[PDB]
Amino acid sequence: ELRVGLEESELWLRFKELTNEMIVTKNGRRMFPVLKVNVSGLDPNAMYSFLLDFVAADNHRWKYVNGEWVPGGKPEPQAPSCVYIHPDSPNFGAHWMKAPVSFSKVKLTNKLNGGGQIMLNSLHKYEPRIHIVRVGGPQRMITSHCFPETQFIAVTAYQNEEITALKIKYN
Ligand SMILES: Cc1nc(CC(=O)N2CCOCC2)cs1
């Protein structure tokens, strides 16, 4: 059985208990913490691409009111985010299972951009998601996995100083 696990859930959980925030910029900003995933039960000889996208966790815009995050009243449909391809892709099952798969180079932006960067809607809450795509075989297959622990609100600057402090403490 193909097993997907979050590396450093310990640390992600400290961020989640405060409501995590991730900065988005015109040119794109790298994530901290970085999403790192442990995968077992791949065919070491089969070929795979690792894909990352972000699900809008609810249909609302969020605002930091009186030191607390609160959702707007006016939900809108949240279109699916674009997918980021892990730059090691495509690669053998053995490659992926030999060390945690680290999405260290994805950049989150608030603007439609050339390439690479993933555009998110500021003040929307997101749940990171990966897709493991078996490629090069005749039989294409996709396994998807969500990481609730890694939820965050996309922000142009930090609202909760407790997040600012944690970001610096563990970087
Ligand atoms: C808005 C959406 N677009 C997609 C596809 C996508 O972004 N890809 C870029 C990198 O891999 C190839 C396809 C899924 S939802």
Task: Tell how far the Cα of 85 is from the centroid of ligand 1, in angstroms.
Answer: 9
Distance 68 CA to ligand 1 centre (A): 34
Please give the number of the atom of ligand 1 that sits closest to the Cα of 79. Answer: 1
Tokens standing for residue 7: 């590396």
Handedness of CA 105, 32, 142, 2 (dihedral sign): positive
Q: Is the dihedral of CA 44, 130, 112, 151 positive or negative?
A: negative
Q: Cis peptide leading into 148, omega within 30 of 0?
A: no
Give the C-alpha separation, 6 to 58, whole Å. 22
**Please, which residues bridge with residue 132 across strands?**
50, 143
> Ligand 1 centre and the CA of 82: distance in Å?
4
* Residue to mutate (ligand 1; options 50, 78, 82, 117; most atoms within 8 A of CB): 82
Method by which the model was determined: X-ray
Whether ligand 1 lies within 6 angstroms of the CB of 82 is answered as yes
Residue 171 to residues 7, 31, 163, 166, Cα–Cα distance (Å): 16, 11, 12, 8
Collect all residues with Cβ–Cβ distance below 8 Å to 95 and sequence separation of at least 6. 88
- Rounded CA gap, 122 and 152, in Å? 11
Taking alpha carbons only, the member of 149, 1, 125 closest to residue 72 is 125
CA angle 106, 110, 113 (to 5 degrees): 70
CB within 8 Å of 151: residues ≥ 6 apart: 16, 20, 57, 125, 126, 127, 128
Cα 61 to middle of ligand 1, angstroms: 23
SS3 assignment for the chain = CCEEEECCHHHHHHHHCCCCEEECECCCEECCCCCEEEEECCCCCCEEEEEEEEEECCCCCEEEECCEEEECCCCCCCCCCCCEECCCCCEEHHHHHCCCEECCCCEEECCCCCCCCEECCCCCEEEEEEEEEEECCCCCEEEEEECHHHCEEEECCCCCHHHHHHHHHHC
Q: Closest Cα to atom 7, ligand 1: which residue? A: 82
Q: How far apart are CA 123 and CA 62, in angstroms?
A: 5
* CATH number for the domain running over 1-171: 2.60.40.820
**How far is Cα 74 from Cα 71, in angstroms, rounded to an integer?**
9
Q: Is 85 in the pocket of ligand 1 (CB under 6 A)?
A: yes
